Amino acid sequence: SLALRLVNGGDRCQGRVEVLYQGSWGTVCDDSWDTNDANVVCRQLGCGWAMSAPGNARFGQGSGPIVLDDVRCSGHESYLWSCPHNGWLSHNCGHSEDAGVICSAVN
Ligand SMILES: [Mg+2]
């Protein structure tokens, strides 16, 4: 029912995090975004371990929905949406804060 991708990284294993929610791709706010969250993304995609969890539109800004904020993974989960989060749809954040990952399998 949900899906996850990275965009604008020049490689499938780094880029801006996007989640398909209710049929539309949205971004993730960087307010609580850390390497625990990035490790979950990298594992879910088959991309190894997280080298970094860059914020502030490191891979550009999205232009539509912002679907998650305040994501707080322990780091061991198998899907980003399985981590604790404050519901769906960010009412707090703008696209200046869109979150990214860089995974070890980048090549
Ligand atoms: Mg977090």
Residue numbers in the entry: 990 to 1096
Please, what does the article write about this entry?
The salivary scavenger and agglutinin (SALSA), also known as gp340, “deleted in malignant brain tumors 1” (DMBT1) and salivary agglutinin (SAG), is a multifunctional molecule found in high abundance on human mucosal surfaces. SALSA has widespread functions in innate immunity, inflammation, epithelial homeostasis, and tumour suppression. The first 13 SRCRs are 109 aa domains found as “pearls on a string” separated by SRCR-interspersed domains (SIDs). The SALSA SRCR domains reveal a classic globular SRCR-fold, with four conserved disulphide bridges, as described for the SRCR type B domains.
SRCR domains 1 and 8 (SRCR1 and SRCR8) were expressed in Drosophila melanogaster Schneider S2 cells with a C-terminal His-tag. The domains were purified by Ni-chelate and size-exclusion chromatography (SEC) and crystallised, and the structures were solved by molecular replacement. This yielded the structures of SRCR1 and SRCR8 at 1.77 and 1.29 Å, respectively. The fold contains one α-helix and one additional single helical turn. The N and C termini come together in a four-stranded β-sheet. Combined, the data from SRCR1 and SRCR8 are thus valid representations of all SALSA SRCR domains. Both SRCR1 and SRCR8 are stabilized by a metal ion buried in the globular fold. The placement suggests the ion is bound during the folding of the domain and is modelled as Mg2+, which is present in the original expression medium and in the crystallisation conditions of SRCR1. Structural inspection of the overlay of SALSA SRCR8 with the corresponding region in the other known SRCR domain structures clearly shows the potential for cation binding at these sites.
